[PDB]
Design a protein around this ligand. Structure first.
Ligand SMILES: Nc1ncnc2c1ncn2[C@@H]1O[C@H](COP(=O)(O)OP(=O)(O)O)[C@@H](O)[C@H]1O
Lengths: 48, 102, 139
């Protein structure tokens, strides 16, 4: 309802990996994704 | 290593352990084959509690693949074939934890 | 032809573009520790001749030791920022992995990358899991 309108970012599970490299890659990918648009807010639920 | 012109061949402790089954024994067999191919040689297995210790009762209650690698090394050190001009140096703390075979 | 060295896929090395943002002035007055960690890591690296002229073979490893939060990781970030050599930080938790042998492989690869990338400083932070005694495992 605020001037964000961009909420969704369905949960966050894909960032699980076996080395910090893949997690850094995925997180900067999502950070650039958020930078794509107006203030983007990332749902972080679905964790166990 | 620095005074003998034999052909030193290193092996760390956690280096013959490979996740894929059997790859932890093909490596030892290839090691000794290379040694035989290289005439006088000496192998200094560094801390060797890794491929060592004592055989544990099997099942899903202990390590087994490391046990198979230990067995392969044992057989190649003294088995049906008598290795010639190959000598092994093993160093490892805690002499009392090794197996009764090695 | 021979191409430039490659295959730095699992590049945990900072090497610019991820450096921490702290100088040696966002840390409040840890004077003794600051001097000691400097004389352990920073001093041997730049003023190398300052050491051999005494026959020392500078120290190669330093530990951190303190209550739950006191700035251990912060001084690590600072030393990493104000440094000329590489810097790879791997926590002592990414080593206890599932598939067997895949653990020690990570240590071997970390040190191989360190040696293959010139002078380097390897930071193993919160290493309290894999350091604890012997307790000859029968399990
Ligand atoms: N003296 C200090 N100066 C600046 N920041 C500090 C100081 N002490 C604690 N902090 C802040 O508190 C946090 C505690 O970090 P630290 O205690 O090193 O982590 P750890 O629990 O791994 O030791 C740091 O991120 C830092 O931002």
């Amino acid at each position: 309802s605020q001037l964000d309108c961009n909420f969704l970012k369905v949960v966050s599970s894909s960032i699980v990996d076996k080395y910090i490299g893949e997690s850094a890659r995925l997180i900067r990918e999502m950070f650039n994704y958020a930078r794509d648009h107006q203030p983007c807010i990332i749902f972080m639920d679905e964790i166990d | 290593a620095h005074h003998t012109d034999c052909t030193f061949i290193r092996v760390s402790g956690s280096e013959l352990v490979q996740k894929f089954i059997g790859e932890g024994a093909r490596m030892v067999r290839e090691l000794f084959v290379m040694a035989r191919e290289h005439a006088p040689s000496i192998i200094f297995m560094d801390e060797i509690d890794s491929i060592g210790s004592s055989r544990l009762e099997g099942g899903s209650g202990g390590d087994s693949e490391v046990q198979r690698t230990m067995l392969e090394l044992l057989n190649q050190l003294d088995g049906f074939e008598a290795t010639k001009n190959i000598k092994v140096i093993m160093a490892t703390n805690r002499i009392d934890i090794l197996d009764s075979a090695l | 032809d021979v191409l430039p060295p490659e295959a730095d896929s699992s590049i945990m090395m900072l090497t610019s573009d991820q450096k921490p943002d702290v100088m040696y002035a966002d840390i409040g007055g840890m004077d003794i520790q600051k001097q000691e960690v400097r004389e352990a890591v920073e001093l041997p690296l730049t003023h190398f001749e300052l050491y051999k002229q005494i026959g020392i073979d500078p120290p190669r490893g330093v530990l951190m030791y303190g209550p739950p939060g006191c700035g251990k990781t912060m001084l690590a970030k600072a030393v990493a920022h104000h440094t000329t050599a590489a810097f790879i930080r791997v926590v002592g938790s990414e080593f206890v992995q599932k598939y067997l042998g895949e653990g020690p492989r990570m240590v071997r690869d970390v040190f191989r990358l360190a040696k293959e990338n010139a002078p380097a400083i390897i930071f193993i932070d919160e290493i309290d899991a894999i350091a604890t005694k012997r307790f000859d495992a029968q399990t």
